[PDB]
Amino acid sequence: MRARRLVMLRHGQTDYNVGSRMQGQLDTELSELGRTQAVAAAEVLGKRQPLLIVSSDLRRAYDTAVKLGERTGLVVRVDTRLRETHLGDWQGLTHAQIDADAPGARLAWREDATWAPHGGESRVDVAARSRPLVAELVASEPEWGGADEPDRPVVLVAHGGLIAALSAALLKLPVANWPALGGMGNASWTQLSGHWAPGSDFESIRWRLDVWNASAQVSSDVLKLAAALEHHH
Amino acid sequence: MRARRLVMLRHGQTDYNVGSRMQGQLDTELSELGRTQAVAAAEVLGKRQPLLIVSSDLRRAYDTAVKLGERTGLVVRVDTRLRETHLGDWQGLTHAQIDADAPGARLAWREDATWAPHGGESRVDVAARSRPLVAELVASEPEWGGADEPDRPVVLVAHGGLIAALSAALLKLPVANWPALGGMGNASWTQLSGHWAPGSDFESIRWRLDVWNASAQVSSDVLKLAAALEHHHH
Ligand SMILES: [Ca+2]
Ligand SMILES: [Ca+2]
Ligand SMILES: [Ca+2]
Incomplete structure (x- = not known):
């Protein structure tokens, strides 16, 4: 009968643009760097034993989510x-x-x-x-x-x-x-807590921001390697 | 448009944190783990080359700030x-x-x-x-x-x-x-960016929440030593 923790994880970098090209619902793929970023985030979040994982069907999100599924058995x-x-x-x-x-x-x-x-x-x-x-x-x-x-x-x-x-x-x-929240980074995550309320009223749950845009630290050697795997220049 | 980055670092853990005992302005001490986590956050934040450090006078914050001062020379x-x-x-x-x-x-x-x-x-x-x-x-x-x-x-x-x-x-x-912004963890940090057009006064700076309550990852080996050092110092 405690608080409900809700974690939201953004996909990693895509092989498309690394800048300002907006993607929306275009179904772009993770780059090798984005897959490495997804592993780094899954290593941190997996330790917390998620109850369940729900992902967008867009591949950049789904493939990020699978790294967490592999590490949690979900x-x-x-x-x-x-x-x-x-x-x-x-x-x-x-x-x-x-x-x-x-x-x-x-x-x-x-x-x-x-x-x-x-x-x-x-x-x-x-x-x-x-x-x-x-x-x-x-x-x-x-x-x-x-x-x-x-x-x-x-x-x-x-x-x-x-x-x-x-x-x-x-x-x-x-x-x-709403513009107070800055943009989520590559494989960064956010956590909200929904605090208990009488009855079954979802509207009665009061949410609070526990974490906004946290990320895993990844070494410069790994970032350099994963970026290079994608190109022949 | 330019931006000023403002990082806010919470003190490392104290024994009152472990005991769910409210601290407020009581001048409680960092635990062994609080010292260890302050070092780990200083390692992450030091790489950003801070411009300057300002700390609360309460020792749990000051002692956390000192780890960042030692890492940065500030x-x-x-x-x-x-x-x-x-x-x-x-x-x-x-x-x-x-x-x-x-x-x-x-x-x-x-x-x-x-x-x-x-x-x-x-x-x-x-x-x-x-x-x-x-x-x-x-x-x-x-x-x-x-x-x-x-x-x-x-x-x-x-x-x-x-x-x-x-x-x-x-x-x-x-x-x-304001209650939308919750707790901060053991030597966790928050970052806001203040965006302004040249010539604007302080109130014209528009602040954005870049990061709330990020932390440094710490290995299970170093958590186990800080626990042994806190235990052996009854
Ligand atoms: Ca036009
Ligand atoms: Ca790793
Ligand atoms: Ca390629």
């Missing part, structure tokens, strides 16, 4: 509600390309979680479609926060936009303050 | 504005003692940054006394976020209550939402 459940924000006309574009089409729009966008100037989803939309998964897991996982092993976390493996929107919504931050 | 400035929340009549009491004397009070306090049923400070009081240190540093450290090495952080070494209150205030979250 199967990776896949839920399309954990997909990254659909970025509409902006998927596959760099900041430079967006800024040339509409100067000022990208920066107004970061500060208005209700806006989707691209034909895709706003951050509010993303929270609205992912929050029901957390409510379902509260209803369906009686061991989560239970008396036997109350600190075993549910782990969600997903994407930076999803994690920021879902965390801000669970925390009940006013939408004006 | 002096540790001391500022009482970085002291932990004064917890009033709760200082020295365990969670169970508080819950027996005032059931629901600890929970109310966790959910309300204006609440101080213990007679000490609220988190609003703690932010109000500590935020001026950050404005003073902005006004008096032209190198911070400056030309040569813009990413070198200012490091404040303090306490979990202070760090949550000061961070929420810098982010300008409404007070109602």
Whole structure:
């Protein structure tokens, strides 16, 4: 009857861009460096005995999640509600390309979680479609926060936009303050705690931010190696 | 647009932490593990080449800051504005003692940054006394976020209550939402970035939460020695 720990892990680096090319729901793959980052995060998070792992179906997230599944003996459940924000006309574009089409729009966008100037989803939309998964897991996982092993976390493996929107919504931050959360890094993780409440009211659970954007330390020699494995230059 | 990086490091573990005994402004000592974890965090944070270090005068924070000063070669400035929340009549009491004397009070306090049923400070009081240190540093450290090495952080070494209150205030979250920022762990750290356009005043800096409550990974071999050293020093 304790607090429910909820961990959210962002995928590692993809083989696509290493910069500002927005991905959205494009189904890009991890680079060798991103796979190494996923191992490093799984080494830390595995020690905490997750209760279950749920991943976005996008390969960059799923393959990250499998590294944690291998280290915990858990199967990776896949839920399309954990997909990254659909970025509409902006998927596959760099900041430079967006800024040339509409100067000022990208920066107004970061500060208005209700806006989707691209034909895709706003951050509010993303929270609205992912929050029901957390409510379902509260209803369906009686061991989560239970008396036997109350600190075993549910782990969600997903994407930076999803994690920021879902965390801000669970925390009940006013939408004006959603930009307070800086972007999640490569294979970084976040932890929220949902504190006990009478009855079965999900809305009565009060969430608090325990960890935002923590990461595993990885040696420079390993980072150099994994980056090099991907290229012949 | 430039950015100033601000790192806040919590003190290492004390015996009161292990015992779930509220500390507040009591001047408790680092345990053997607290010293060890402070070294490990200094190893991580030292690589960032901090610009300067300011620490609370409470020894658990100061002794943590000294490990970072030794690793970096920097002096540790001391500022009482970085002291932990004064917890009033709760200082020295365990969670169970508080819950027996005032059931629901600890929970109310966790959910309300204006609440101080213990007679000490609220988190609003703690932010109000500590935020001026950050404005003073902005006004008096032209190198911070400056030309040569813009990413070198200012490091404040303090306490979990202070760090949550000061961070929420810098982010300008409404007070109602300050309880969204929870605890900080044993020598864990938080990082905010202050973004500003050249010419702006302190209030025009927009702060963002880059990292909340990150930690250094420590090997099971070094946890087992600090446990043996804490045990053998009964
Ligand atoms: Ca490793
Ligand atoms: Ca245009
Ligand atoms: Ca390749």
